[PDB]
Write an enzyme that holds these catalytic residues in place. Sequence first.
Site, mmCIF file in Angstrom:
data_model
loop_
_atom_site.group_PDB
_atom_site.id
_atom_site.type_symbol
_atom_site.label_atom_id
_atom_site.label_comp_id
_atom_site.label_asym_id
_atom_site.label_seq_id
_atom_site.Cartn_x
_atom_site.Cartn_y
_atom_site.Cartn_z
ATOM 1 N N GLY A 99 96.713 0.920 15.399
ATOM 2 C CA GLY A 99 97.493 0.598 16.446
ATOM 3 C C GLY A 99 98.538 1.650 16.811
ATOM 4 O O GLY A 99 99.225 1.319 17.878
ATOM 5 N N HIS A 148 90.277 4.754 25.380
ATOM 6 C CA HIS A 148 89.356 4.024 24.431
ATOM 7 C C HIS A 148 90.033 2.572 24.228
ATOM 8 O O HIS A 148 89.336 1.620 23.474
ATOM 9 C CB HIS A 148 89.286 4.597 23.320
ATOM 10 C CG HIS A 148 90.444 4.664 22.240
ATOM 11 N ND1 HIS A 148 90.978 5.866 21.910
ATOM 12 C CD2 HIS A 148 90.897 3.794 21.377
ATOM 13 C CE1 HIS A 148 91.855 5.719 21.041
ATOM 14 N NE2 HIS A 148 92.001 4.472 20.797
ATOM 15 N N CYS A 202 97.814 4.562 18.334
ATOM 16 C CA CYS A 202 97.103 5.347 19.566
ATOM 17 C C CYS A 202 98.063 5.211 20.844
ATOM 18 O O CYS A 202 98.633 4.268 21.015
ATOM 19 C CB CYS A 202 95.780 5.196 19.741
ATOM 20 S SG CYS A 202 94.712 5.836 18.573
#
Lengths: 299, 301
Positions: B143, B41, B145
């Site tokens: 932030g 993503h 991920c």
Amino acid sequence: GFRKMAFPSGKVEGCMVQVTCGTTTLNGLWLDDVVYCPRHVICTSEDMLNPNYEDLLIRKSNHNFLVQAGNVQLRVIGHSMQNCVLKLKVDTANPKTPKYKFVRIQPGQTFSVLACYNGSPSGVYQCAMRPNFTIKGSFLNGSCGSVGFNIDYDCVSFCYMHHMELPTGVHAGTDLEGNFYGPFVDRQTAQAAGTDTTITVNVLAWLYAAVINGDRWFLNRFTTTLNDFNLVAMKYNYEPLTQDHVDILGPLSAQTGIAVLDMCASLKELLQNGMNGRTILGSALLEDEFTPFDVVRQC
Amino acid sequence: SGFRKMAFPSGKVEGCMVQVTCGTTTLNGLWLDDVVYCPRHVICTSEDMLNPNYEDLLIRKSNHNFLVQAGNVQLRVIGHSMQNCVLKLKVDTANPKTPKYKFVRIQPGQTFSVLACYNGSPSGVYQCAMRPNFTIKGSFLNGSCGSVGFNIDYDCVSFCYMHHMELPTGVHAGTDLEGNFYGPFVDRQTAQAAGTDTTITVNVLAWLYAAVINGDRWFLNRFTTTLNDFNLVAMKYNYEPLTQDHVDILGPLSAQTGIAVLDMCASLKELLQNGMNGRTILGSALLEDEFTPFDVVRQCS
Ligand SMILES: *[C@@H](O)[C@H](C[C@@H]1CCNC1=O)NC(=O)[C@H](CC(C)C)NC(=O)OCCSc1ccccc1
């Protein structure tokens, strides 16, 4: 959403070495061209009971110290003793030396521990310096010379070197100048600590953390003066709360809209009643090893 | 209690963290040899996230759309592909800090260290347990991920987790390093529910073994049970059933204490059916379920 978090340990791992004298092996910290380690590495069996360290040290030569950085031996070209820490000068600079300083931490402050065995990092966890200057660590045979530290920006601040385990199972050690935290001595004797107290400003930080993550069963509409709170705190062997502590909790009070003294009133009720078998952030006990900084950074 | 949640030293993983940016979306990636692994993503516009069309979003992408940085130093991307929920970016430089490593898929109850990272910079390391409902109780901010979870065996880093999302209840979900989610979750900005969680029985047993090793053994009874009888009782207390692999990973502690696994199960069964009755184990009336048998042996020995 709130966890006890250690600093990333890589900058410290690159400094750990193994130091051996005779049959005694422990860890050292290799910064630039100096290795720092607990002086009792120079002790044998008979020595540890009541060692005369200056006497033991003068009878040693540079070549009796075996320092291994991994599969590589470093040559000791000089040695000195600063309080309970031995400083070994080697002929090679550690290229992995981070920017660093040596600091002496205050009781109630937290730091990360890099537990090491035979010069090899094994685990990392967060500790607080207790009011009675012990720490509740996890250290086994061979862990001496493991260090505690904080990281600010690029800079590693070393605050703790490990030396001993007390009969109650808590731990004691020195700053990197070799001065013990607390009334302990590096001799093989059963030592008791002073009465431990609970770090009240940290319990309050943690209660605020529990509110941020939505656990507020303990809150109340009551309130208290600072002094009246401190009377109850002292009764229960909690440290008194200072006006600087109240100021330090400001950000958390702002964030949550809960006045510091309102949170003190909640804590007073918990001290007098208990948790009624309930839990806060998962714990059946009030946690006191999170500082306000630790909470803020992470929320 | 004498036991700390202890993470692995994070240095070998710190040496592999990078950042990956598409447009203004930055998350973390894992740089091993000449490949960077990160959540797919990253390619999402904040408006594409409700139900992204990942295949279509990727088709428009070229190598030159991906900004990969180690610190502020750009790493040139020379190839890109998608494997389940992870993006693989081939880069033109082999990471000189690549450790010996493997990619493993862990089971519920297993623990691992998480190196929480932002913009490719590590902020902290802590131990997590994979819950039976395939969530972890992490500490992750926007932030985070692409932060990874791992174990270290001797010199070898086993990467088991990559972080992708938060659930409404505050817990966290993600994938293995082949991009397969743990549990029934998907990488869409939708509200998803974890199954009701349960207690990790195998780890409670490890905790009881730990208590015995330290001389705290009031709860040992004279009886035993079958595994099936124990499992049917355990489910009524929202405890996980044991598998044969659970019985096997308790072997070393069983051998260290001489207490058969099924006898310890019978002791646990009595604790469940009768409660602690005001007593404590390792200085707690609560049974701990986030120490694995390996973790117990780590700290005790
Ligand atoms: C590192 O060398 C080692 C670390 C401890 C081993 C077990 N866990 C530890 O934290 N340090 C020592 O063993 C200490 C060495 C001294 C400073 C020379 N000694 C120590 O901690 O001894 C145990 C103190 S308690 C005791 C002593 C005697 C009789 C009963 C109880």
